[PDB]
């Protein structure tokens, strides 16, 4: 089975460096032009750099010239991207991508369609410091009720939410995060339930924010008066 697996992404301050790698298996890696293609959050795709099978012809997007370096190790079936002098605008999910064309050689960077892609590795360039979320209950009250958890003021993306350690999945909505004017992210996760269940059943949201190693379990129960 064909695999491309990227790694090396993370949060870095502007001006600093990162090195991405893409490890390939399941095909003759040393016979193809390989590429990096990036996708800024909410945006479209942009070719970043490419390198021919032999690794002697390479090309770069204008925006990363002088800053990024693509290279390959055919013995390790691996592709790399050295990224120096990172800027906020370099923030993106970085995909490793295989060219469709088996190489015609004559030593050139060519091709231009990508038929196999990795899952991508996320790069965030910012002077903002990692910050874990505060988790607040969205309590139900008064035949369907709703409850939830507010996951507020964290950085950077992403945060994941489950309910009852994965046991509650139907009726759940975990919303896309929004960027607040503070520069921090916030989202809510909700679930609709039969009203009668409010007295009978326990609801706990499980919040994970990997960048800050923040794991929070918040029991959500009806409010009284």
């Amino acid at each position: 089975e064909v695999q491309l697996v990227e790694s090396g992404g993370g949060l870095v301050q502007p001006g600093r460096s990162l090195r991405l790698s893409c490890a390939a298996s399941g095909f003759s890696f040393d016979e193809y032009t390989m590429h990096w293609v990036r996708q800024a959050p909410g945006k479209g795709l942009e070719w970043v750099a490419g390198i021919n099978w032999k690794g002697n012809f390479m090309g770069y997007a204008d925006s990363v010239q002088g800053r990024f370096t693509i290279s390959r190790d055919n013995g390790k079936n691996s592709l790399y991207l050295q990224m120096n002098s990172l800027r906020a605008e370099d923030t993106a999910l970085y995909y490793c991508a295989k060219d469709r064309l088996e190489s015609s050689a004559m030593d050139i960077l060519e091709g231009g369609t990508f038929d196999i892609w990795g899952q991508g590795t996320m790069v965030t360039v910012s002077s903002a410091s990692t910050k874990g979320p505060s988790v607040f209950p969205l309590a139900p009250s008064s035949g369907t009720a709703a409850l939830g958890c507010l996951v507020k003021d964290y950085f950077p993306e992403p945060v994941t939410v489950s309910w009852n350690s994965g046991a509650l999945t139907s009726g759940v909505h975990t919303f896309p995060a929004v960027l607040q004017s503070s520069g921090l992210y916030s989202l809510s996760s909700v679930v609709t339930v039969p009203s009668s269940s409010l007295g009978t059943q326990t609801y706990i949201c499980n919040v994970n924010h990997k960048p800050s190693n923040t794991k929070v379990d918040k029991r959500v129960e009806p409010k009284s008066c």
């Binding site: 231009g112 607040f136 929004v178 916030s186 909700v190």
Partner: protein
């Protein structure tokens, strides 16, 4: 540089209907070197078409491409549910290779009015100076909805943000949250918090509300 302009921004189509997606280039794309990709949320792009008209291996026959020069089209002859995605065109006739900005294909279904819920700030949040009030719209179609905040009957502006889910894979509906953010100081100053919802599936707007500190 070759700029690719896709249209429309969004297509809404019932299953079985024809999807026609356009890609226009700012200069001639040499040798019809134009590709189309499908991208679903959380997933990497998938190559559908290359050379303007050639289906990639494994791609269903309902996908086809045509065109040359500056005008190209992707056609899905009869839309399947799983075709909900963003579609991107890409030229590789001239370097640097460039992509269009995408056309989103969403699935049309019958109108469904949202159920609406309102959440006051928790006492835990209140203990530290900020109050968030949340309005939830559940399981609705179409996407377009108006969600207005009223505080003691005064309509709010500029102090709320919305977030919308992707279309449900099961029932093709959306859900939406609107979040009103106030300081704890002015939160405690007011009594009646309401979200008013206007939607095609509602004969008149629906309001959910709570009275601060009450039950």
């Amino acid at each position: 540089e070759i700029v690719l302009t896709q249209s429309p921004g969004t297509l809404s189509l019932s299953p079985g209907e024809r999807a026609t997606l356009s890609c226009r280039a700012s200069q001639s794309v040499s040798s019809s070197y134009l590709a189309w990709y499908q991208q679903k949320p959380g997933q990497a792009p998938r190559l559908l078409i290359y050379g303007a008209s050639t289906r990639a291996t494994g791609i269903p026959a309902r996908f086809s491409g045509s065109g040359s020069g500056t005008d190209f089209t992707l056609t899905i002859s009869r839309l399947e549910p799983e075709d909900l995605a963003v579609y991107y065109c890409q030229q590789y006739g001239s370097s640097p290779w460039t992509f269009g900005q995408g056309t989103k294909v969403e699935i049309k279904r019958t109108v469904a009015a949202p159920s609406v819920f309102i959440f006051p700030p928790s006492d835990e949040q209140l203990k530290s100076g900020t109050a968030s009030v949340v309005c939830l719209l559940n399981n609705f179609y179409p996407r377009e909805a108006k969600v207005q905040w009223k505080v003691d009957n005064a309509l709010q502006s500029g102090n709320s943000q919305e977030s919308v889910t992707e279309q449900d894979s099961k029932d093709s509906t959306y859900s939406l949250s609107s979040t009103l953010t106030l300081s704890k100081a002015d939160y405690e100053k007011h009594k009646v918090y309401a979200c008013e919802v206007t939607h095609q599936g509602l004969s008149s707007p629906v309001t959910k509300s709570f009275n601060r500190g009450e039950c």
